[PDB]
């Protein structure tokens, strides 16, 4: 099986907020990994602790759901979630694709993004290089899609995780390296953002100017 | 206190070998489950392989064939040697123990002690300097009156670079991207700045890259590139 997490989840201090772990026996550990940090165990089984994690932590599981609710939000709460269990193929161990959990501290902000296509200096080099820019959202947490027309595109993409701007709101950017034959043989390249359940589509083409 | 503490990893290219070890301090590797588990820059946590305690190996099959994971009781650290390495390996590198069953003889997915973990990264890259392109404001960049303009910064080694826009007279609005670590091993970011749509005909952009580890500096100059 794989495990999906969704992307964010988020509670202002003191209030209360719960991550679903979906897997396509059956039971999930949690862990917690703040930035530059090793994971943390959480939570293992259905509700069971290790010593030292608060009693703001519980589990719980509802046929192929696991959930981890935590209780009342610490600013040192925020940081990445991963689900573990047992897999169905040939590994032994699956993990999920991570939840960031967000202590709102500011209002939330909806995600501005710019699409640069290609220089032509770039070209030049033989090379080919979309640029897709996020910024000015919270929480800072996105996710990226690329397309080539309509037909999604995975290979030769880099995205950088969330950072601050100077305004406090978080920046993000994503790369699709392409040859200079690929970006030319399409109509057109597009770069989907989500944010918060909300998507953000822009759209670039060969023939530009 | 109980520790794990990692140690190996660094620059090795495409193809080489690499070993990574794990000692433990204060409790034994013998009679316990040892997993590896590594994370890819800006990446999720991706299983890699687990011994049992009497001996028996599993491993994932992005890592099947070409890694190996050791026990050695006398010194009481863990090992994984790593052979026929690819772009696909780089990343930090964590051991843990993973707690067994109550009833049987099978680990669990708990993992409760951990190390600090150690990078992993497959370049055959050297001191490289970068190339600077740039990001052009035009229709699509501009909104409400202000402008989005920036340079690409690509292919350079070893991190890091810094960014300024006109001499540092221009930092208001400037947000410099962190670097990206591409599959050719090389690095990129992106540095933009956001200004008035007006003063695209008059004023003048220039960023100016700096990668010391290459003595190269290159200002590059901002402009609508109209076609």
């Known amino acids: 099986s794989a495990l999906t997490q969704p992307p964010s989840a988020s509670g202002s201090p003191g209030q209360s907020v719960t991550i679903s772990c979906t897997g396509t026996?059956?039971?999930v550990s949690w862990y917690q990994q703040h930035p530059g940090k090793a994971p943390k165990l959480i939570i293992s089984?259905?509700?069971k602790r290790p010593s030292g994690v608060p009693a703001r932590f519980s589990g719980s599981k509802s046929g192929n759901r696991a959930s981890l609710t935590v209780s009342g939000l610490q600013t040192e709460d925020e940081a990445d979630y991963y689900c573990?269990?047992?897999?169905?193929?040939?590994?032994?161990?699956?993990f999920g694709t991570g939840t960031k959990v967000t202590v709102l501290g500011q209002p939330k902000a909806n995600p501005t993004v710019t699409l640069f296509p290609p220089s032509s200096e770039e070209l030049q080099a033989n090379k080919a290089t979309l640029v897709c820019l996020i910024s000015d959202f919270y929480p800072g947490a996105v996710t990226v899609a690329w397309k080539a027309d309509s037909s999604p595109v995975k290979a030769g993409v880099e995205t950088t995780t969330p950072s601050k701007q100077s305004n406090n709101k978080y920046a993000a950017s994503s790369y699709l390296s392409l040859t200079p034959e690929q970006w030319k043989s399409h109509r057109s390249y597009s770069c989907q953002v989500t944010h918060e359940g909300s998507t953000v589509e822009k759209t670039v083409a060969p023939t530009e100017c | 206190e109980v520790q794990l503490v990692e140690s190996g990893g660094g620059l090795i290219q495409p193809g080489g070998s690499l070993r990574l070890s794990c000692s433990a301090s204060?409790?034994?590797?013998?009679?316990?489950?040892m997993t590896w588990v590594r994370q890819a820059p800006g990446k999720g946590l991706e299983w890699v392989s687990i011994?049992?305690?009497?001996?028996?190996?599993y491993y994932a099959d992005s890592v099947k064939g070409r890694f190996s994971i050791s026990r050695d009781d006398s010194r009481n650290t863990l090992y994984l040697q790593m052979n026929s390495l690819r772009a696909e390996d780089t990343a930090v590198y964590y051991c843990?123990?993973?707690?067994?069953?109550?009833?049987?003889?099978?680990?669990?997915?708990?993992?409760?002690?951990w190390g600090q973990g150690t990078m992993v990264t497959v370049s055959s890259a050297s001191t490289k300097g970068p190339s600077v392109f740039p990001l052009a404001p035009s229709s699509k960049s501009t909104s409400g009156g202000t402008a989005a303009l920036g340079c690409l910064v690509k292919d350079y080694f070893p991190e890091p670079v810094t960014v300024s826009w006109n001499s540092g007279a221009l930092t208001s609005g400037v947000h410099t991207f962190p670097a990206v670590l591409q599959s050719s091993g090389l690095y990129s970011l992106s540095s933009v700045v956001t200004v008035p749509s007006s003063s695209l005909g008059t004023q003048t952009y220039i960023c100016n890259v700096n990668h010391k580890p290459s003595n190269t500096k290159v200002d590059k100059k901002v402009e609508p590139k109209s076609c």
């Open positions: 089984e259905v509700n």
């Open positions: 204060e409790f034994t590797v013998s009679g316990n489950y």
């Open positions: 026996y059956n039971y």
């Open positions: 011994i049992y305690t009497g001996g028996s190996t």
């Open positions: 843990a123990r993973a707690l067994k069953l109550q009833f049987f003889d099978w680990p669990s997915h708990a993992f409760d002690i």
């Open positions: 573990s269990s047992y897999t169905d193929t040939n590994n032994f161990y699956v």
